[PDB]
Amino acid sequence: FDTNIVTLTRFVMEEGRKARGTGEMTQLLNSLCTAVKAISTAVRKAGIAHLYGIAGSTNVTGDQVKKLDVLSNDLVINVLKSSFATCVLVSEEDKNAIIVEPEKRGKYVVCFDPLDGSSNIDCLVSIGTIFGIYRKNSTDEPSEKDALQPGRNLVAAGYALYGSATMLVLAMVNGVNCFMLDPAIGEFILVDRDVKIKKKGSIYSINEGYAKEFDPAITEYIQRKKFPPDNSAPYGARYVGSMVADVHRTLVYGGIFMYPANKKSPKGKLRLLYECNPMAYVMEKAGGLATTGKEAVLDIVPTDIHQRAPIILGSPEDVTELLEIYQKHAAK
Amino acid sequence: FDTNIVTLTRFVMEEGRKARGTGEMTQLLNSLCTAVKAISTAVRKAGIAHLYGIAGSTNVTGDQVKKLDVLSNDLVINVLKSSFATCVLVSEEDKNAIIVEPEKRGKYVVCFDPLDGSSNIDCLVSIGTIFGIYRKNSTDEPSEKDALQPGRNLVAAGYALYGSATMLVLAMVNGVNCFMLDPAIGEFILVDRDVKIKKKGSIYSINEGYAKEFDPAITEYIQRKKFPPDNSAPYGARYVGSMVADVHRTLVYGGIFMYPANKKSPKGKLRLLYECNPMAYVMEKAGGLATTGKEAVLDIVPTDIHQRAPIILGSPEDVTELLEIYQKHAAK
Amino acid sequence: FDTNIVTLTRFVMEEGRKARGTGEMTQLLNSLCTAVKAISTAVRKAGIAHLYGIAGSTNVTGDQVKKLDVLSNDLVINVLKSSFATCVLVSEEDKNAIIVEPEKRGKYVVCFDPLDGSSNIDCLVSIGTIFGIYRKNSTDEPSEKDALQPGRNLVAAGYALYGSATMLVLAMVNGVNCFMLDPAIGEFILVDRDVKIKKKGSIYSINEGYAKEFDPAITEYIQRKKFPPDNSAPYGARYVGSMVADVHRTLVYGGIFMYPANKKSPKGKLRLLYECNPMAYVMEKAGGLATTGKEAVLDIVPTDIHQRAPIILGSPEDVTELLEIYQKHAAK
Amino acid sequence: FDTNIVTLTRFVMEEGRKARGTGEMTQLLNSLCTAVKAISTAVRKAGIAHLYGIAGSTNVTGDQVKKLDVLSNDLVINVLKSSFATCVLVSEEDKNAIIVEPEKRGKYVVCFDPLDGSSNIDCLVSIGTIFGIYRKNSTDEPSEKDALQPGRNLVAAGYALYGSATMLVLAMVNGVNCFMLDPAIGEFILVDRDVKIKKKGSIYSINEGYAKEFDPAITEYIQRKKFPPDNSAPYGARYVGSMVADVHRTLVYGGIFMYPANKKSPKGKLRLLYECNPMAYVMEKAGGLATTGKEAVLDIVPTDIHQRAPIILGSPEDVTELLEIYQKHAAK
Ligand SMILES: O=P(O)(O)OC[C@H]1O[C@@](O)(CO)[C@@H](O)[C@@H]1O
Ligand SMILES: O=P(O)(O)OC[C@H]1O[C@@](O)(CO)[C@@H](O)[C@@H]1O
Ligand SMILES: O=P(O)(O)OC[C@H]1O[C@@](O)(CO)[C@@H](O)[C@@H]1O
Ligand SMILES: O=P(O)(O)OC[C@H]1O[C@@](O)(CO)[C@@H](O)[C@@H]1O
Ligand SMILES: O=P(O)(O)OC[C@H]1O[C@](O)(CO)[C@@H](O)[C@@H]1O
Ligand SMILES: O=P(O)(O)OC[C@H]1O[C@](O)(CO)[C@@H](O)[C@@H]1O
Ligand SMILES: O=P(O)(O)OC[C@H]1O[C@](O)(CO)[C@@H](O)[C@@H]1O
Ligand SMILES: O=P(O)(O)OC[C@H]1O[C@](O)(CO)[C@@H](O)[C@@H]1O
Ligand SMILES: [Zn+2]
Ligand SMILES: [Zn+2]
Ligand SMILES: [Zn+2]
Ligand SMILES: [Zn+2]
Ligand SMILES: [Zn+2]
Ligand SMILES: [Zn+2]
Ligand SMILES: [Zn+2]
Ligand SMILES: [Zn+2]
Ligand SMILES: [Zn+2]
Ligand SMILES: [Zn+2]
Ligand SMILES: [Zn+2]
Ligand SMILES: [Zn+2]
């Protein structure tokens, strides 16, 4: 049997032992883990519980809200508040930032996507929860501005993946580690230490249904993945449709994931605060790259908690190849 | 609480009540359900249990065997034998058919894929188990020939999907029904009755990495999905990479799934006995279509338990559109 | 991993293979197993689900009904009906016998106690479900009379024990076997084969709070267990308070369990149909004995589906010792 | 669904919010909760996992060690060390105190019984885990002496009960609260707030098999419980055999539990450090009493980490009644 179980709690406590912190990061992550287990359990039996379907509302980004978006959002909001580790919260499901009541205030600002992969819920395909954590910079009263920090300022970011197994991928200043949920004891156990992405992959991931709207650079790159100029084997294609799933595969298999800007969407579709930045952080800590095609995602200074951003991430050699193409097409 | 739980066992027993059978179909399905729950539990904690990785072997179709292929295969083989409902078994993982020992012989022939979606195991993307059940036709001693029946002879077929939730999709002569696994009591509960696929979808699913090998018909169809000649909205793209996941989404969302024959693979990649036929059966019972591009999958008389077959399935209007293109290109 | 799991279903199917039955016993037990798992799951989280407390009613035997009695009763009634294996049902919670509607009729009569150990529910002490199964003897329309058979006519009996682990103890014509519920896959797995009770134990079990009402024989026996006339070590005492728990310990540890008739209760407290008979059957098949103090429990021909009966059971040498005392005191 | 789950972690963090502690008590309890869930899961499937049986050793108190004692002991020892909240550990299973290595040292001393109720493991009757927590008093290097504190110095104590449901009963300076384990998400949820024991119960709990060794006071009290001098109804008897189970029932139902000193055991059987003191603390915080028959358990200054102590606890009026009897018999 276990007897010496290596949990996310222990792992996090241990590494930050000689950094003598306040300890609230641990409180924060422990809290998030509780909500993640609750979301997982609900998702695992969503049909029997009648949790599929719309809630009857639309969020600021214009998505039709689902029952599971509400359940997961409430779950995350409640546990984060109770953690005594947060002050400002940003969620895809909330029009404005949520200022934590004075009595339960902590030093962290948490941006999160309660349930990523909306279109894949009803078909039982992988979905998840994405988060990014910042330290409140200002001395002012906590406000929405505290969430308007560039991703390079993240102190922690990651995601929960409700796939064939539930995984919690956590990135911090020194690296990325994967923790898998043990359903029997409800604990996230370390399974992959210091994850590093391949320098070059052999899988490209993008929705080719938008081919008519793709810019010449994306068009050229895809054509190149199918018809290699050097006659190497063409890349395989994979597109689950849920950002969390496609990014996770990219992380452990290598390759590239793309949700670029197209002729109808100047800033792409994915949201910078709770989708792009967290994944960008994970990628960089794994030795990968994350760009919009013209600048590093983590360097963007946001002006809107719900603003969108194009994103191309994954193996450094793959991303760089596409950046070279963008630059080749760069028109003044 | 439940109190009146509608299980797969009850559901199956009830419908076939006034058909006064021997009752072994129920025994068969009950047995398969046990193995499916065992596979699901293992998959849900594969990382912690060290179940990821190769087993150190290659099957007849040339796939590198994984630890989970072995575990799932053994699990399925053992429960089916113990069911007293089978005589001949065909598995992707076994070179030859397995003849059930006389003492435990039943009247059914079961073709199955213990674990579908090999490439997606390590990245936690949806995987599953596929099966097709036939009644032994001959009076001869049970043999591999008993598995060489055309899919139109199936009396039952379906699949287990280990996705965000575990689902058991079962098709029989009168229709398709979905049952979701309730982790707490280990029972498959009815969640979707008499499932019917949309006449026309808006999602196409195929690995576009093989574009250089696609025949002109597949090439034309894809181009048509991206650039509609009538200026309707282009179809969205989705390709999880695991047959079971892509087919399931096709079933409940509508649209089309393709794994065609290409310039390097005359008969495509997917196996007819335990991949193509079962899914083809499910599709037809849901009012969908399943073709190779030139003939109906279910009408193919197999000559090899491991033979391959091209497959195009899903919404009738989508499949028909592609068939028209194939016929347009048909060269004598 | 498992791969060759030995379930109650398989075990039952296998032993009765060369007895060529209709197969409905298996259907019956499979059904009962589903309800047992549902009861277990509910019990395991009764506090969180607010399932503790009275329902607001009294049964024929005068017990105050609990929410869990209702939940478990409904669960058992529903699954048994759906099994197509029963015709008459007797439950501690139903005033009169339940005649199964014609369409779902089977040949079995099932007497059951949906939830045994009422006083121990709120304190989280072991509780269970007890059942006894008879074959309908008559040719008449099914009626309450069909349940009025002496326990020696049982073809199957046993109990579910919701203790530190959930166990299903099943006795049939050839012996007793224990099956433990595997929470992960929701299957009862064989753990103890052909259980036999010790010829003589060293534990006596009875509620000594009724000492003022005990007959001289019970009084003498207890005194003898505390002050052995031969100076052997006195028996240890154990009285959980739930029949199922005390009887189970008696079965695997040996010894004796008593709920005798006292000065205020001529027929004791425990009910013959769904408490005494099933346990008496289990005991005898394990090589134990079960008496009222004057006659064998299994030989009593009941006149009331809810009648009570004194019961003394366990190790043959222990029971016989007490019977000798009863006979020593026997007054004409 | 949940969405606002009230866990032991949250509950503990919240109450001690305005006490501005180091926060290690929370770390300690969180750690203990992980081990408790692991023990529970193992216990729930002990038979299938082959965890029943002896380990092949004897502890200082002379008990034959069981496989589950080892598993639970290792589990508790490992999590407590990893908590960074302890310095000295005392376990029924370890001859000497365990001094936590400098690097993982915390300010707490934890006395614990990894698995209580040894005799009841094989029969599936309720078992548990008992603990008592002290703050290191001295300034010296941590040593076994740090565990030799009187129970009145406890800052926290409680127990895990692996019964029909798993409960974590926690007592601290201001009171007792019960938390039930939710198997689905592996979280202890608050179910009973500020538990208080009845002033007078109607159940007595003791092993009457030792009647030949009982002192006159215990003898008189028992006789009085069976034959009330005022003709009130006699108390009911209950004796599960596992301290944790009997004490828990005493707490929520009221009444009295006894494991007195007898003619052959001057100090009774139960151990003061990890059995008597913790339960005594829980009882007092619930408004109950706990005595040896001559002095308060919590006032005893231990001289041996494994010393034994008689114990009588429960409803104040019941305990006081017995104390009066002891005093009536008090011989100089
Ligand atoms: O304990 P505190 O004060 O919350 O902060 C410490 C944390 O900072 C980091 O998130 C920085 O990446 C971790 O290294 C560490 O757990
Ligand atoms: O009970 P038997 O004899 O195994 O066969 C009956 C079965 O045939 C079918 O599979 C035909 O599609 C079901 O309708 C039914 O459960
Ligand atoms: O399959 P049927 O017809 O229901 O009856 C067979 C059963 O009878 C018994 O219950 C007799 O004790 C079992 O031996 C056996 O499973
Ligand atoms: O957080 P620290 O420093 O470990 O100590 C605080 C704790 O002391 C107590 O255990 C005292 O009973 C709790 O009130 C509280 O959680
Ligand atoms: O259907 P599309 O446009 O390809 O969008 C897929 C994206 O939608 C999202 O669900 C966000 O709305 C992401 O998880 C995912 O990558
Ligand atoms: O990588 P490819 O060639 O697109 O193959 C995907 C197919 O491989 C399989 O795993 C079969 O080997 C199917 O589940 C799936 O549809
Ligand atoms: O409290 P008493 O009278 O000892 O009764 C205990 C008996 O009560 C029952 O709950 C039946 O009502 C049995 O499970 C148990 O053996
Ligand atoms: O068998 P006995 O002597 O009554 O002992 C019971 C006691 O034994 C213990 O298991 C301790 O060894 C306690 O849990 C329990 O109360
Ligand atoms: Zn959305
Ligand atoms: Zn998202
Ligand atoms: Zn979202
Ligand atoms: Zn394969
Ligand atoms: Zn496959
Ligand atoms: Zn396969
Ligand atoms: Zn009752
Ligand atoms: Zn009962
Ligand atoms: Zn009852
Ligand atoms: Zn012990
Ligand atoms: Zn103990
Ligand atoms: Zn112990």
Q: Helix/strand/coil (H, E, C) string of A220-279?
A: HHHHHHHCCCCCCCCCEECECCCHHHHHHHHHHHCCEEEECCECCECCCCCEHHHHHHHH
Q: What angle do CA B281, B284, B285 make, to 5 degrees?
A: 85
Q: For residues C50-80, b (16+ Cβ closer than 10 Å) or e, as one string? A: ebbeeeeeebeeeeebbbbbbbbbbbbbbbb
Instruction: Write the CB contacts of A12 (distance below 8 Å, at least 6 apart in sequence).
Output: A25, A26, A29, A170
Helices (H), chain C: 8-15, 24-44, 67-82, 216-226, 243-253, 277-285, 316-329
Using a CB cutoff of 5 Å, list residues around ligand 15, an ion: C 63, 118
Cβ-contact A167, A153 below 8 angstroms: no
Residue A80: which H helix or E strand, with range? helix A67-82
Atom of ligand 3 nearest to the CA of C28: 4
Instruction: Kindly report the backbone phi and psi dihedral angles of residue B63, in degrees, each rounded to the nearest multiple of 5, phi listed first.
Output: -80, 145
In angstroms, the CA A226 to CA A236 distance is 8
Do C212 and D234 make contact, defined as CB atoms within 8 angstroms? yes
Confirm whether C115 is a catalytic residue.
yes
Cβ-contact D197, D186 below 8 angstroms: no
Atom of ligand 1 nearest to the CA of A108: 4
How many residues are listed for chain D in this entry?
Answer: 332
In angstroms, the CA A60 to CA A94 distance is 8
DSSP at C145: G
Cβ-contact C329, C296 below 8 angstroms: no
In angstroms, the CA C32 to CA C77 distance is 9
Instruction: Kindly report the backbone phi and psi dihedral angles of residue A242, in degrees, each rounded to the nearest multiple of 5, phi listed first.
Output: -115, 120
* Helices H / strands E in chain B, number of each: 7, 15
* Helices H / strands E in chain A, number of each: 7, 15
DSSP string, A123-144: TT--EEEEEEEEE---SSS--G
For ligand 18, the distance from its centroid to the CA atom of residue D297, given in whole angstroms, is 20
Nearest to B276 by CA among B237, B318, B320, B244: B244
Rg value, chain B, Cα: 19
| A-B contacts (CB, under 8 Å) | 164
Tell which one of B119, B127, B214, B250 to mutate to probe ligand 6, the residue whose CB is within 8 A of the most ligand atoms.
B119
Cβ-contact B66, B122 below 8 angstroms: no
For ligand 7, the distance from its centroid to the CA atom of residue C152, given in whole angstroms, is 24
- Structural determination approach: X-ray
Tokens of D148: 């030799």
Cβ-contact D106, D233 below 8 angstroms: no
The total of other beta-carbon atoms located within 10 Å of residue A199's CB is 12
Catalytic residues of B: 63, 69, 92-93, 113, 115-116, 275
Q: For residues B178-207, b (16+ Cβ closer than 10 Å) or e, as one string? A: bbbbbbbbbbbbbbbeebebbeebbbbbbb
Cβ-contact C67, C55 below 8 angstroms: yes
Residue with tokens 């509302």: A57
A269 lines ligand 5 (CB under 6 A): yes
Distances D94 to D179, D274, D306 between C-alpha atoms, Å:
28, 12, 9
In angstroms, the CA D4 to CA A204 distance is 40
Cβ-contact D322, D259 below 8 angstroms: no
C195-329, CATH topology level: D-Maltodextrin-Binding Protein; domain 2 (3.40.190)
Instruction: Write the CB contacts of A199 (distance below 8 Å, at least 6 apart in sequence).
Output: A254, A287, A315, A316, A317
Nearest to D318 by CA among D243, D224, D244: D224
Q: Tell me the nearest-neighbour CA distance from C164 into chain B, angstroms.
A: 17
Instruction: Kindly report the backbone phi and psi dihedral angles of residue B112, in degrees, each rounded to the nearest multiple of 5, phi listed first.
Output: -150, 160
Residues in chain C whose beta carbon is closer than 8 A to a beta carbon of chain B? 1-5, 7, 9-10, 13-14, 17, 23, 27, 30, 34, 37-38, 40-42, 49, 51, 71, 74-75, 78-79, 82-84, 103, 184-187
D260 lines ligand 8 (CB under 6 A): no
Sign of CA dihedral C137, C139, C145, C147: positive
> How would you class D142 by CB atoms within 10 Å of its CB: exposed for 0-12, middle for 13-18, buried for 19 or more?
buried
In angstroms, the CA D8 to CA D156 distance is 14
Nearest-by-Cβ selection for C48 from D125, D161, D182: D182
How many residues are listed for chain C in this entry?
Answer: 332
Instruction: Kindly report the backbone phi and psi dihedral angles of residue A79, in degrees, each rounded to the nearest multiple of 5, phi listed first.
Output: -65, -40
C25 lines ligand 3 (CB under 6 A): yes
Helices (H), chain B: 8-15, 24-44, 67-82, 216-226, 243-253, 277-285, 316-329
The total of other beta-carbon atoms located within 10 Å of residue D329's CB is 14
Confirm whether C251 is a catalytic residue.
no
**By three-state DSSP, how is residue D281 classified?**
helix
Nearest-by-Cβ selection for B237 from A122, A164, A209: A209
In angstroms, the CA B15 to CA B1 distance is 25
In angstroms, the CA C316 to CA C287 distance is 7
Nearest to C325 by CA among C248, C232, C220, C194: C220
How many residues are listed for chain A in this entry?
Answer: 332
The residues with which A7 forms a beta bridge, in sequence order, are: A189
Confirm whether C93 is a catalytic residue.
yes
In angstroms, the CA D235 to CA D226 distance is 6
Instruction: Provide the edge-to-edge strand list for the sheet that holds D311-314.
Output: D236-237, D203-205, D256-259, D311-314, D289-291
Nearest to B138 by CA among B130, B129, B147, B126: B147
Confirm whether C194 is a catalytic residue.
no
Cβ-contact C86, C134 below 8 angstroms: no
Residue A74: which H helix or E strand, with range? helix A67-82
In angstroms, the CA C220 to CA A108 distance is 73
**By three-state DSSP, how is residue B143 classified?**
coil
Q: Name the residue with the closest Cα to ligand 1, atom 1.
A: A23
Confirm whether A92 is a catalytic residue.
yes
> How would you class D31 by CB atoms within 10 Å of its CB: exposed for 0-12, middle for 13-18, buried for 19 or more?
buried
Give the residue from chain B lying closest to D183, CA to CA.
B184
In angstroms, the CA B7 to CA C316 distance is 43
Residues in chain B whose beta carbon is closer than 8 A to a beta carbon of chain D? 183-184
Helices (H), chain D: 8-15, 24-44, 67-82, 216-226, 243-253, 277-285, 316-329
Cβ-contact B77, B91 below 8 angstroms: yes
Instruction: Provide the edge-to-edge strand list for the sheet that holds A98-99.
Output: A98-99, A86-91, A105-116, A127-135, A156-162, A166-172, A175-182, A187-192
Q: Which class in CATH covers the domain with range C4-194?
A: alpha beta
In angstroms, the CA B171 to CA B154 distance is 10
Q: How far is CA C69 from the centre of its chain?
A: 16
First-to-last C-alpha distance (Å) of chain C: 64
Give the residue from chain B lying closest to D185, CA to CA.
B184
Cβ-contact D185, D44 below 8 angstroms: no
Distances A324 to A291, A295, A311, A312 between C-alpha atoms, Å:
12, 12, 15, 13
D327 lines ligand 4 (CB under 6 A): no
D21 lines ligand 4 (CB under 6 A): yes
**By three-state DSSP, how is residue A102 classified?**
helix
Test the A interface: residue of B3, B123, B221, B239 with most A CBs within 10 Å: B123
Cβ-contact A314, A257 below 8 angstroms: yes
User: Largest Cα–Cα distance in chain C?
Assistant: 64
Q: Name the residue with the closest Cα to ligand 5, atom 5.
A: A241
In chain B, where the domains are located: 4-194, 195-329
Tokens of B177: 């029904």
Instruction: Write the CB contacts of A69 (distance below 8 Å, at least 6 apart in sequence).
Output: A55, A59, A63, A93, A114, A115, A118
DSSP at D103: G
C116 lines ligand 7 (CB under 6 A): yes
Instruction: Write the CB contacts of B261 (distance below 8 Å, at least 6 apart in sequence).
Output: B215, B267, B268, B292, B293, B310
Atom of ligand 2 nearest to the CA of B23: 1
Name the neighbours of A, counting chains with at least 3 Cβ pairs within 8 A.
B, C, D
**By three-state DSSP, how is residue A95 classified?**
coil
B22 lines ligand 2 (CB under 6 A): yes
Instruction: Kindly report the backbone phi and psi dihedral angles of residue C50, in degrees, each rounded to the nearest multiple of 5, phi listed first.
Output: 60, 40
Tokens of A254: 């290598």
Cβ-contact B110, B80 below 8 angstroms: yes
Tokens of B170: 């079962």
In angstroms, the CA B276 to CA B130 distance is 10
Instruction: Provide the edge-to-edge strand list for the sheet that holds C175-182.
Output: C98-99, C86-91, C108-116, C127-135, C156-162, C166-172, C175-182, C187-192
Q: Tell me the nearest-neighbour CA distance from D167 into chain A, angstroms.
A: 14
Atom of ligand 3 nearest to the CA of C27: 4
Distances A214 to A220, A294, A329 between C-alpha atoms, Å:
10, 15, 13
